[PDB]
């Protein structure tokens, strides 16, 4: 028995591109037919864009995708590695429910964790999120990012139903399809910050959008068992986790809490890393990657 | 050093912004509150920096009073940095206190500023404009600050600023709108 030369896991909660678009207030209930944002360049030769004078508003558009049953992998060379991984993933599944992941997903849905740099000097944040079965909606919400503070995980009354819904989702108890969209308060004639590639702001044609990976990052700020200091707040979940913005890389490999050794121990020889590590382990199994030899 | 308004505060960690990624927001959400809101009995200091290390922000250091800076603990104008920062309240200062030197001034490093001035003042163009214009006198004021990207581009522009000496005597009154000492001995506790 040894490691796995090839591994391939499949992603969960994938969003679309979050196009920006504008409007006004008290027409936010008539936002099926609404305008968009513009892209222009000024004097080097770089891009910079701007809202009009009629609008403090900015708008977000994306929708989500759970799959269910994320323990079972899709690429290996050892059949015995599957026969040693099945007991571990079933052991984590059967003894406890997945709602601890689900609160920490669904409050980032509820807060402005995805509106990262859309509240650098804002005043009133209002987000509206839909649960879409078919051509209409049947379980509607409208959430707030002022209430739950952006570094703690303290739950409210809206959060448990969405948590048990998404925990039915990623565990295989029913496919869910969220649509998470937002309405902003920016500034009457204010500069925008969309994405880029590897200056040119990343311009979808006749609009402005940010890619899939930024929101697929933003909705999994689940690492708050990283070792050094836990008063700071949630950062996302990465094997060999390095972050540019806070600079210092959490969870170094020269001491034993990185993913590539706790996976070895938790999976194979059935000895357990901590219960203050488990939801980080299964969040790594949610993310996916090439975990080889 | 007659005022006794020392309000200390710490930082908060966030993953969606570097030091400039909140420093430009601080430059956006401090100047208008010190201009459109205003208050000559309110400002800031810079007593915890360094030259080579480039320490621009490391703790709460403000200058307020019982009424002018007394709205710095019930202010919803600085709401939003609850994922990246916090604040405090003023405390009783002692008799012998220090006073550091700072300046929120504008440094200029234009080697072709003579050409852009002579385009409306002299008519000397860029062809013969290299005879006596300042080719290297417009130096840069390298220092650590935030990267405020105006309409000229989205890149992070350097925040030039000059530090100052340390004197035992003080000078109470009014400073510039940015809090840097334009004649007044700034605070450094």
Complete domains list, chain B, with CATH:
1-189 (3.30.70.2540)
DSSP-derived secondary structure letter, A249? P
Residue A150 has its nearest CB partner, among B22, B83, B151, at B83
Instruction: Say if residues A209 and A19 touch (Cβ distance below 8 Å).
Output: yes
Among residues A147, A167, A166, the alpha carbon closest in space to that of A157 is found at: A147
Ramachandran area for residue A23 (φ above 0: left; ψ -120 to 50: alpha; else beta):
left
**Tokens standing for residue A127:** 């987000």
Instruction: Say if residues B162 and B107 touch (Cβ distance below 8 Å).
Output: yes
Instruction: Say if residues A158 and B66 touch (Cβ distance below 8 Å).
Output: no
Among residues A263, A287, A276, the alpha carbon closest in space to that of A89 is found at: A263
Which chain B residues are Cβ-neighbours of A249 within 8 angstroms?
none
Return all residues near A32 (Cβ < 8 A) that are at least 6 apart: none
Phi and psi of B7, rounded to 5°?
Answer: -120, 105
Q: Which site among A120, A184, A195, A215 would you substitute to test the B interface, given the most B Cβ atoms closer than 10 Å to its Cβ?
A: A120
Residue found under tokens 């060999």: A240
How far out from the chain centre does Cα B62 lie?
12
The reply to whether residue A221 touches residue B14, judged by beta carbons under 8 angstroms, is: no
Q: Can you list the pairs that A127-132 forms with residues at least 24 positions away whose Cβ atoms lie under 8 Å?
A: A127/A180, A127/A181, A127/A182, A127/A183, A128/A181, A128/A182, A128/A183, A129/A178, A129/A179, A129/A180, A129/A181, A130/A178, A130/A179, A130/A181, A131/A165, A131/A176, A131/A177, A131/A178, A131/A179, A132/A63, A132/A177, A132/A178, A132/A179
Residues of chain A numbered 54-73 and touching chain B (CB < 8 Å): none
Please report, for chain B, how many H helices and E strands are present, in that order.
2, 4
Query: How far is Cα A101 from Cα B144, in angstroms, rounded to an integer?
Result: 39
The reply to whether residue A245 touches residue B12, judged by beta carbons under 8 angstroms, is: no
The reply to whether residue A44 touches residue B153, judged by beta carbons under 8 angstroms, is: yes
Consecutive H or E run containing A262: helix A259-263
How many other CB atoms are found less than 10 A from the CB of residue A177?
Answer: 14
How many other CB atoms are found less than 10 A from the CB of residue A224?
Answer: 19
Whether chain B has a CB inside 8 Å of the CB on A157: the answer is: no
Shortest distance, CA A120 to any CA of chain B (angstroms):
6
Q: In sequence order, which ranges of A59-136 are alpha helices (DSSP H)?
A: 79-94, 99-110
Q: Which site among B11, B13, B17, B82 would you substitute to test the A interface, given the most A Cβ atoms closer than 10 Å to its Cβ?
A: B13
Query: How far is Cα A187 from Cα A55, in angstroms, rounded to an integer?
Result: 7
Query: How far is Cα B30 from Cα B78, in angstroms, rounded to an integer?
Result: 8
Return all residues near A51 (Cβ < 8 A) that are at least 6 apart: A22, A37, A58, A186, A187, A188, A189, A190, A192
Shortest distance, CA B25 to any CA of chain A (angstroms):
6
Cα distances (angstroms) measured from residue A93 to each of A3, A8, A18, A68: 22, 20, 33, 12
**Stated resolution in angstroms:** 2.9
Structure solved via: cryo-EM
Which chain A residues are Cβ-neighbours of B13 within 8 angstroms?
151, 232-233, 235, 246
Query: How far is Cα A270 from Cα A87, in angstroms, rounded to an integer?
Result: 9
Q: Which pairing describes strands B6-7 and A41-42: parallel, antiparallel, or unpaired?
A: unpaired
Question: Catalytic residue numbers of B?
Answer: 31
Write out the E strands in chain A.
18-20, 41-42, 46-47, 62-63, 126-131, 139-140, 143-144, 178-183, 208-210
DSSP-based three-state secondary structure for A63: strand
Among residues B122, B145, B140, the alpha carbon closest in space to that of B132 is found at: B122
Task: Please tell me which residue of chain A has the smallest CA distance to B30.
Answer: A121
Burial class (CB in 10 A: 0-12, 13-18, 19+), B1: middle
The reply to whether residue B153 touches residue A245, judged by beta carbons under 8 angstroms, is: no
Instruction: Say if residues A166 and A103 touch (Cβ distance below 8 Å).
Output: no
Consecutive H or E run containing A41: strand A41-42
Cα distances (angstroms) measured from residue A193 to each of A19, A190, A224, B155, B165: 12, 10, 28, 12, 39
Residue B13 has its nearest CB partner, among A42, A218, A232, at A232
Whether chain B has a CB inside 8 Å of the CB on A244: the answer is: yes
Burial class (CB in 10 A: 0-12, 13-18, 19+), A72: middle
The reply to whether residue A119 touches residue B29, judged by beta carbons under 8 angstroms, is: no
**Tokens standing for residue A243:** 């972050």
Which chain A residues are Cβ-neighbours of B153 within 8 angstroms?
42, 44, 46, 48, 199
DSSP-based three-state secondary structure for B11: strand
Query: How far is Cα B163 from Cα B172, in angstroms, rounded to an integer?
Result: 19
Among residues A238, A202, A236, A237, the alpha carbon closest in space to that of A17 is found at: A202
Residues of chain A numbered 190-209 and touching chain B (CB < 8 Å): 191, 193, 199, 201
Consecutive H or E run containing B29: helix B19-31
Query: How far is Cα B90 from Cα B64, in angstroms, rounded to an integer?
Result: 7
Query: How far is Cα A251 from Cα A241, in angstroms, rounded to an integer?
Result: 6
Query: How far is Cα A289 from Cα B187, in angstroms, rounded to an integer?
Result: 52
Residue A233 has its nearest CB partner, among B13, B21, B24, at B13
Instruction: Say if residues A140 and A179 touch (Cβ distance below 8 Å).
Output: no
Residue found under tokens 């308060």: A185
How many other CB atoms are found less than 10 A from the CB of residue A159?
Answer: 20
Consecutive H or E run containing B115: helix B113-121
Query: How far is Cα B189 from Cα B186, in angstroms, rounded to an integer?
Result: 10
Q: Which site among B153, B155, B156, B157 would you substitute to test the A interface, given the most A Cβ atoms closer than 10 Å to its Cβ?
A: B153
Return all residues near A265 (Cβ < 8 A) that are at least 6 apart: A271, A272, A273
DSSP-based three-state secondary structure for A89: helix
């Amino acid at each position: 028995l040894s490691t796995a030369s090839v591994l391939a896991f499949e992603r969960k909660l994938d969003p679309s591109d979050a196009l920006m678009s504008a409007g006004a207030w008290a027409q936010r209930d008539a936002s099926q037919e609404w305008p968009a944002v513009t892209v222009r360049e000024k004097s080097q030769t770089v891009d910079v864009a701007n809202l009009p004078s009629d609008a403090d508003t900015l708008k977000v558009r994306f929708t989500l995708r759970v799959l269910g049953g994320a323990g079972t992998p899709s690429a290996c060379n050892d059949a015995a590695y599957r026969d040693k991984l099945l007991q571990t993933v079933a052991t984590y599944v059967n003894d406890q429910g997945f709602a601890e992941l689900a609160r920490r997903y669904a409050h980032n849905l509820a807060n402005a964790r995805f509106l990262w740099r859309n509240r650098v000097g804002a005043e009133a944040v209002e987000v509206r999120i839909n649960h879409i079965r078919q051509g209409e909606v049947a379980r509607a919400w409208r959430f707030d990012a002022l209430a739950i503070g952006l570094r703690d995980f303290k739950a409210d009354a809206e959060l448990d139903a969405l948590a048990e819904l998404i925990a039915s989702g990623l565990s295989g108890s029913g496919h869910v399809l969220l649509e998470v969209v937002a309405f902003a308060r920016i500034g009457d004639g204010q500069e925008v910050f969309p994405s880029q590639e590897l200056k040119t702001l990343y311009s979808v044609r006749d609009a402005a959008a940010i890619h899939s990976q930024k929101i697929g990052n933003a909705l999994r700020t689940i690492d708050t068992w990283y070792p050094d200091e836990d008063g700071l707040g949630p950062i996302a979940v990465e094997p060999y986790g390095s972050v540019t913005s806070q600079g210092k890389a959490y969870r170094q490999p020269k001491q034993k809490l990185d993913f590539y050794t706790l996976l070895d121990n938790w999976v194979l020889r059935d000895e357990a890393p901590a219960v203050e590590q488990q939801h980080y382990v299964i969040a790594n199994l949610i993310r996916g990657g090439v975990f080889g030899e | 050093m007659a005022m006794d308004h020392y309000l200390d505060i710490r930082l908060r960690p966030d993953p969606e912004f570097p030091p400039a990624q909140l420093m430009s927001v601080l430059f956006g959400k401090l100047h208008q509150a010190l201009v459109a809101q205003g208050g000559d009995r309110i400002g800031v200091s810079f007593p915890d920096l360094d030259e080579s290390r480039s320490r621009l922000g490391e703790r709460l250091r403000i200058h307020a009073s019982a009424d002018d800076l007394r709205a710095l603990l019930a202010r919803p104008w600085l709401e939003g940095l609850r994922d990246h920062l916090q604040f405090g309240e003023p405390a009783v200062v002692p008799h012998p206190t220090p006073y550091r030197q700072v300046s929120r001034v504008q440094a200029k490093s234009n080697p072709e500023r003579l050409r852009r001035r002579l385009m409306r003042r002299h008519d000397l163009s860029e062809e013969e404009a290299r005879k006596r214009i300042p080719d290297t006198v417009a130096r840069a004021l390298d220092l650590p600050f935030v990267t405020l990207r105006s309409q000229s581009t989205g890149q992070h522009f350097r925040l030039f600023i000059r530090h100052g000496p340390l004197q035992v005597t003080a000078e109470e009154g009014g400073f510039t709108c940015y809090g840097l000492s334009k004649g007044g001995f700034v605070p450094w506790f």
